[PDB]
């Protein structure tokens, strides 16, 4: 499950396709928790491609459902990224992840 709450401005048509290296100013967040990962803090806006399962399924499905300029807001389920596993020190198991995703992409 990927719950999208798009803040309106964008274009609504430049969708990420397969093998398109796309750029996201992401900003991570835990439900009832703080940030854990931010491309805005690094100022390195995470040039990633679609179709290789580089990113988690909660972040991959939210990218193709957005367009250029759009500012959505992910609500990632635990079972798609780290629900039983959990990352050591960053993501606990059974965490419902929150992301500030703005698709200002390339290709």
Numbering used by the authors: 1 to 107
Please share text taken word for word from the publication where this structure appeared.
RyRs are calcium-activated calcium channels critical to excitation/contraction coupling in heart and skeletal muscle. Ca2+, ATP, and caffeine are well-characterized activators of RyR, synergistically activating the channel by inducing a rotation of its activation core and pore opening. We use cryo-EM single-particle snapshots of ryanodine receptor type 1 (RyR1) to exemplify the discovery process facilitated, and the new insights revealed by our approach. Broadly speaking, conformational changes along CC1 involve the cytoplasmic shell, the activation core, and the pore; those along CC2 involve only the cytoplasmic shell.
In qualitative agreement with the experimentally estimated association probabilities, the binding interactions become favorable from state 3 (“S3”) onward, becoming most probable at the FINISH conformation. In the absence of an associating Ca2+, the energy of a transition from S1 → S6 increases, corroborating the experimentally determined trend in Fig. 1a. At the hotspot, the trajectory crosses over to the +ligand landscape with ~0.24% of the probability of association with a ligand, terminating in the region of lowest energy on the +ligand landscape (“FINISH”). The path explored goes through the minimum-energy point of each landscape, which probably corresponds to a partially open state for the minimum energy of the ligand-bound state. The distance change between Calpha of opposite protomers shows a pore dilation of ~4 Å along the least-action path, which is about 2 Å less than the dilation observed between the classes chosen from the clustering analysis and to the previous reports.
